Amino acid sequence: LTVKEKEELIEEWQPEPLVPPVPKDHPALNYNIVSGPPSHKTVVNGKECINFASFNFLGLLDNPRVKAAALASLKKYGVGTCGPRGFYGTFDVHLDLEDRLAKFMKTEEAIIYSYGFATIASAIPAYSKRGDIVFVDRAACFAIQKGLQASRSDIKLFKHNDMADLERLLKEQEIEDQKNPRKARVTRRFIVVEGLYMNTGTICPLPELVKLKYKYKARIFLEESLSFGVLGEHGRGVTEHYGINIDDIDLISANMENALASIGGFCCGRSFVIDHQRLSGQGYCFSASLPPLLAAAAIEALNIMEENPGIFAVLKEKCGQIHKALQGISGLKVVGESLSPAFHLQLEESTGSREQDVRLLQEIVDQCMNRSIALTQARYLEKEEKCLPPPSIRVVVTVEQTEEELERAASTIKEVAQAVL
Amino acid sequence: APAYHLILEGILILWIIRLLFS
Amino acid sequence: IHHVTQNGGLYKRPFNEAFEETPMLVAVLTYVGYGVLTLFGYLRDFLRYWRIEKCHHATEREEQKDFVSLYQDFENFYTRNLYMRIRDNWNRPICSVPGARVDIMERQSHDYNWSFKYTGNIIKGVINMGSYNYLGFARNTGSCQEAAAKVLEEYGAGVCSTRQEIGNLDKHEELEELVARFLGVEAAMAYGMGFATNSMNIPALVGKGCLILSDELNHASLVLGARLSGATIRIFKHNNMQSLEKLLKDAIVYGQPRTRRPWKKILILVEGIYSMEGSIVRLPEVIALKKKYKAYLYLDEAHSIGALGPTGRGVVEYFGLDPEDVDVMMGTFTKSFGASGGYIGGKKELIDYLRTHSHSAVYATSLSPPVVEQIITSMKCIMGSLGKECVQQLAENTRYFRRRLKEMGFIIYGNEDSPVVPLMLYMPAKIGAFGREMLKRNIGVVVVGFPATPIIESRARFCLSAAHTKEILDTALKEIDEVGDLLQLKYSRHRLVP
Amino acid sequence: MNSRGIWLSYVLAIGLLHIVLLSIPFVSVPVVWTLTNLIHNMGMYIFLHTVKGTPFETPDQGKARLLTHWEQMDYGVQFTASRKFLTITPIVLYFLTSFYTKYDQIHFVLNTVSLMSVLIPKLPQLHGVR
Amino acid sequence: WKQMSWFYYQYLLVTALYMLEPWERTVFNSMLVSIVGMALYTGYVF
Ligand SMILES: CCCCCCCCCCCCCCCC(=O)CSCCNC(=O)CCNC(=O)[C@H](O)C(C)(C)COP(=O)(O)OP(=O)(O)OC[C@H]1O[C@@H](n2cnc3c(N)ncnc32)[C@H](O)[C@@H]1OP(=O)(O)O
Ligand SMILES: Cc1ncc(COP(=O)(O)O)c(CN[C@@H](CO)C(=O)O)c1O
């Protein structure tokens, strides 16, 4: 019954603290400070160096055309919006960019979010509900994993890049379908897949995954946040790469931060599906919209990509020779295809643990800053993760490099890889 | 002037009161 | 000193918050209205097994689409049947800077709101009362905004990297030292979206085996970050200390549901000046009550970071408490500073943990240069020249607008000094009609319903500003009085006659 | 819910279903009391026991679309203040259709049957079977 | 009284008739005249 003298006595209860004491050894703790803009020739900690770890694959960041078109829209709009876009928060630069992205991807409509991590964390759970089943790549990025967790449902992970395993896993759903035909009519299936993964670094097989959707009646959500403005003859995603109609890929969602060098994300598709996020998109309505000087810098960058569709051939040649020039180093190996831009350098013959394994790569990175070359290693959260990648180094190539600066990059890293490993 | 339901019509008053206290 | 309670919390100034009760005549006629719309909803949805009555409207591909209906037939019975009838009152585009008078694009539908066309004419002058423009820092030609275009040249328009790896500029450290001296805390950290300060740092803090003591009507992002954390959520009633204290000493004697063990830690998520019912939290009574039961407090001042107080710093300065008494502080720079993003605030043993384990610092890119150099020069202006003058202006526009609008005979929620003023429209047809009549009268307002608030509690919000003058307000009070008689919105038993 | 306001509309709904279904002089009989019992018991069974789901969109993300209206309301709490009111008032309509019926066992077989198809699904035993 | 134009406007608001299409707002209006028509029918007997 727990009388009033007992219930006051049980107030000796003391809790855990709000935050455990992070150790000094903790790797993330120290952040690099960059003076000036993080352009091609950046200054990291007072060291003039040529970077290989920012994502502006087309430059477009120190472009006089882009910085002039974004200055002319600070002079008539100020900086910020005020309202959350359902309430006087659409500035008409927004209407002019959602209209202009849908014509670039040749679809019917696009929506624009104001932050790149929430464009796909809030677009998965608007469609997927509790009684579903989603088949994931299993090499997916964190932004998908946070969207799948909010869309409470059944998540089933198939192995990396194999249709055999994907097929194997669909056939069991048709078995459980015909064992309860009544309830198999009310549940929808989705396949969530990426093009050019940011972990593994390869492309998914898309032509044999689309003729596999017409058999098992699933739906495809492609998430091309890296291959938007990289792959294809016109830079048009991964569907130009293979030659597949866009009317077969359902939802498509990139972000405007890597090839466009801006802030925020979009999500383009047909108007039957893209017209349901305005009210149920969690991050769309309950949040302020995008500053109109960032939406004017994204129209102008999107004009530059249509003036020369020949910038996509000098990015494919550029990234082709540095992937050949890193094949004979002893200690650490190359993961990714020739046409892919990031290609992180993994560590071959692991020492033993992780904290020791990160410590080996910290010395290779820190030694190269003294030569001329800036690079970083891929950061992760080891505890909140469905499949944890091994430690690696990320090597990001851009168009504003040179054959001479690309070779100097491969010969310098081979000279210090064997002097530490 | 009942016909034949006045017992069950009595127990419906009882079932209200058994339902009410909770 | 002014008022002490049994919860131990003491108030130094009076707390006068009133919430009128529905008249019960109006409350009947709201269900008569909502049922009619529903009854006809089926009728409009009845013609779906015959695609001839209505065409050229969003439907499946029908060339290879024999899958499961993507939207449940019963489902979305609100977007395409009730929202769509009065839909021309929300997504209104703008042609100029959003301070005081603003241009509106004129549009017109022929399909009874299924597709639009933009005529060409723009309403040149329109008093707007739907923009978080406190202290009015939203202008195109200002001294504070003149130093944001200088850093927009050399710096760029967006760092193509993440804070942990090559995406940490030197602008980002000179902001996080300035905020910590603004608030009165030891460290700080800035993010880039204020929605994702909450949905990305609540799950890094609490976990599985902890209790979250939410408030009945919080924002949708505090709801999201408490769902991703895996902690157990219990909802206490709106601004009710008796309902919290019951729910908080019932959770200590007992424990985790099935296993009955003790909880690991308990945190309470509250806000300052809630947007829907604009009302300040009873903050001396939570702090005097979390010291009794040894819980933690997640304060969240987004609608009061520049908008309330003797100098505008916080809901903490308003009550006269020391900030070093609240575990975490949240904030967005979109309301009073006219810039995107948001901070978080606390001790150095917490910000060292959030620079390390938060989801945004490792996967998401950071603030863009130009918008980070606008929050810096606008925060410096508040400390002084003329920064303590525009705060006193917003304090006396609130009082004047509020009593002159309550003496008329409307039903207004909220506290006496809270610059969001909700007017009550308890009918679903007056949502689509109060919004459309004010454009004839040259004034733009904001009207909401079920998506943001309770279905039966439709209202209209009147976010004030310091760029509003006395002559702008009296023009607007002249036209609410006329529309208040045209649709009969004056219904409150009391009437504060002067 | 507004417990005074939602009950008052519900009582006025019975009074409006009674006054329109009254004396109708092609059928000039006081069996319109029995017809007020017949329509309403079949009306409740549709809107509280047949229609399954919720009228909005993504309430709490995924929420129970396989649960009826009677068993999704009030967060599934047994006998609160309104669950009694919804099971005490249709049984009182049985009493009024026997003071103006003056039992004659031909409309009686339509009043007890229409009462059990309302009373049995409100029992807190069977919860999810159908 | 000429002011009957205003009293009809209130009938559209407090019955949610205002936002309904004017090709299917008479279906409601032609029904209620017959409901009252079948209620003035109702009136004589009993
Ligand atoms: C006529 C036309 C009308 C026109 C209108 C159009 C409007 C135009 C658009 C304008 C755009 C406006 C932009 C500005 C917005 C603004 O200025 C700020 S306005 C921001 C206010 N927004 C909202 O508040 C929306 C979300 N609100 C809720 O979600 C409520 O809470 C419900 C009562 C609905 C859930 O109630 P429920 O869902 O029925 O109950 P559940 O248990 O199913 O809840 C489902 C899961 O969430 C958990 N949970 C429920 N409550 C919770 C709470 N309190 N605190 C923490 N968690 C809560 C439950 O524990 C479940 O967790 P799980 O067990 O993990 O699944
Ligand atoms: C606790 C909390 N967190 C976040 C936000 C909005 O985030 P934002 O920075 O994206 O506007 C608000 C207010 N949200 C406002 C934004 O103006 C709205 O109208 O939706 C809030 O109260």
Number of separate domains in chain E: 1
- Asked whether residue C188 falls in the same domain as residue C105, the answer is no
Q: Within an 8 Å CB–CB cutoff, is residue D23 touching chain E?
A: yes
Six-digit token pair at C3? 């008022």
Smallest CA–CA separation between A128 and chain C, in Å? 9
From A317, A343, A308, A325, select the one nearest A399 (Cα to Cα): A317
In a domain, E6, yes or no: no
Show which residues on chain A lie within 8 Å of chain D, measured between beta carbons.
125-126, 129-131, 150-153, 279-280
3-class secondary structure, A361: helix
What number of C-beta contacts closer than 8 Å exist between C and E?
Answer: 40
In a domain, E13, yes or no: no
Please answer yes or no on whether A150 and D61 come within 8 Å at the CB atom.
Answer: yes
Q: Is residue C234 left, alpha or beta, with left meaning phi > 0 and alpha meaning psi from -120 to 50?
A: beta
Please identify, by atom number, the ligand 1 atom nearest to the C-alpha of residue A87.
10
Residue nearest atom 19 in ligand 2 by C-alpha distance: A84
> Which residues are paired to C235 by β-bridges?
C214
In a domain, C13, yes or no: no
Write out the catalytic residue numbers of C: 275, 303, 335
Distance from C-alpha of A336 to C-alpha of A186, rounded to nearest angstrom: 40
- Cα–Cα distances (Å) from C169 to A52, A80, C160, D22, in that order, read 16, 21, 11, 80
Angle at D48 between CA D43 and CA D53, to 5 degrees: 125
In a domain, C496, yes or no: no
| Cα C401 off chain centre by | 20
* Chain A contact set for C163 (CB, 8 A): 31
Residue nearest atom 22 in ligand 2 by C-alpha distance: C302
Q: Is residue C316 left, alpha or beta, with left meaning phi > 0 and alpha meaning psi from -120 to 50?
A: alpha
Backbone breaks in chain A after residues (C–N over 2.5 Å): none
3-state secondary structure chain C: CCEECCCCCEECCCCCEECCCCCCCCCHHHHHHHHHHHHHHHHHHHCCCCCCCCCCCCCCCCCCCCCCCCCCCCCCCCHHHHHCCCHHHCCCEECCCCCCECCEEEEECCCCCCCCEEEEEEECCCEECCCCCHHHCCCCCCCCCCCCCCHHHHCCCCCCCECCCECCECHHHHHHHHHHHHHCCCEEEECCCCHHHHHHHHHHHCCCCCEEEEECCCCHHHHHHCCCCCCEEEEECCCCHHHHHHHHHHHHHCCCCCCCCCCCCEEEECCCCCCCCCCCCCHHHHHHHHHHHCCEEEEECCCCCCCCCCCCCCHHHHHCCCCCCCCEEEEECCCCCCCCCEEEEECHHHHHHHHHHCHHHHHCECCCHHHHHHHHHHHCCCCCCCCCCHHHHHHHHHHHHHHHHHCCCCCECEECCCCCCEEECCCCCCHHHHHHHHHHCCEECEEECCCCCCCCCCEEECCCCCCCCHHHHHHHHHHHHHHHHHCCCCCCCCCCCC
Please answer yes or no on whether E14 and C427 come within 8 Å at the CB atom.
Answer: yes
Distance from C-alpha of B11 to C-alpha of D119, rounded to nearest angstrom: 14
* Chain D contact set for B10 (CB, 8 A): none
- Asked whether residue C364 falls in the same domain as residue C459, the answer is no
Range of the domain at E25: 20-46
Contact between residue D102 and residue D110 where contact means Cβ atoms under 8 Å apart: no
The string over A160-190, giving b where at least 16 C-beta atoms fall within 10 Å of a residue's C-beta and e elsewhere, is: bbeeeebeebbeebeeeeeeeeeeeeebbbb
The residue assigned the tokens 């990426």 is: A194
| Cα C337 off chain centre by | 15
Q: Which of C327, C361, C379 is the last residue of a domain?
A: C379
Residue nearest atom 20 in ligand 2 by C-alpha distance: A286
Distance from C-alpha of C36 to C-alpha of C412, rounded to nearest angstrom: 28
Six-digit token pair at C383? 């400390």
Residue nearest atom 10 in ligand 2 by C-alpha distance: A287
DSSP state of A317: T
Instruction: Using CA coordinates, name the residue in chain A closest to D56.
Output: A280
At C71, which CATH number?
Answer: 3.90.1150.10
Range of the domain at C249: 145-379
CB atoms within 10 A of CB A331: 16
| Domain ranges across chain D | 3-122
Contacts of D108 (CB under 8 A, 6+ apart): B3, B5, D101
Six-digit token pair at C346? 């606390």
Number of separate domains in chain C: 2
Q: Which of C354, C379, C404 is the last residue of a domain?
A: C379
- Cβ of C431 less than 6 Å from ligand 1: yes
Strands (DSSP E) contained in A52-197 are 109-113, 133-136, 155-157, 189-194
How far does residue A151's CA lie from ligand 1's centre (Å)? 15
Contact between residue A116 and residue A331 where contact means Cβ atoms under 8 Å apart: no
* Chain D contact set for E35 (CB, 8 A): 20
How far does residue C410's CA lie from ligand 1's centre (Å)? 27
What number of C-beta contacts closer than 8 Å exist between D and E?
Answer: 22
Instruction: Using CA coordinates, name the residue in chain D closest to C224.
Output: D60
Q: Which of C379, C406, C440 is the last residue of a domain?
A: C379
Sign of CA dihedral C172, C176, C177, C179: positive
- Cα–Cα distances (Å) from C130 to A89, C84, C446, in that order, read 9, 21, 6
Q: Which amino acid is at D86?
A: L
In a domain, E12, yes or no: no
- Cβ of C4 less than 6 Å from ligand 1: no
Smallest CA–CA separation between E33 and chain D, in Å? 12
What's this structure's resolution in Å? Answer: 3.2
Give the H/E segment covering residue A332: strand A332-334
Determine phi and psi for D95, rounding to 5 degrees. -70, -35
* Chain E contact set for C429 (CB, 8 A): 12-19
- Cβ of C116 less than 6 Å from ligand 1: no
* Chain C contact set for D65 (CB, 8 A): 72
Contact between residue A103 and residue C120 where contact means Cβ atoms under 8 Å apart: no
The residue assigned the tokens 């009646």 is: A217
* Chain E contact set for C33 (CB, 8 A): 14-16
- For chains B and A, having 3+ Cβ pairs within 8 Å is answered no
Range of the domain at A72: 64-307
From C284, C9, C290, C186, select the one nearest A15 (Cα to Cα): C290
CB atoms within 10 A of CB C110: 9
Contact between residue A108 and residue A238 where contact means Cβ atoms under 8 Å apart: no
In a domain, E2, yes or no: no
Sign of CA dihedral C109, C114, C117, C123: positive
Q: Within an 8 Å CB–CB cutoff, is residue D20 touching chain E?
A: yes
- For chains E and D, having 3+ Cβ pairs within 8 Å is answered yes
In a domain, C310, yes or no: yes
Contact between residue A393 and residue A377 where contact means Cβ atoms under 8 Å apart: yes
Please answer yes or no on whether D25 and E38 come within 8 Å at the CB atom.
Answer: no
Residue nearest atom 5 in ligand 1 by C-alpha distance: C449
Neighbours of chain A (3+ CB pairs under 8 A): C, D
Experimental method: cryo-EM
Distance from C-alpha of C177 to C-alpha of C193, rounded to nearest angstrom: 19
The residue assigned the tokens 């929430």 is: A118
The half-sphere exposure of C145 on its side-chain side, counting CA atoms within 13 A, is 21
Residue nearest atom 1 in ligand 1 by C-alpha distance: C83
How far does residue C331's CA lie from ligand 2's centre (Å)? 9
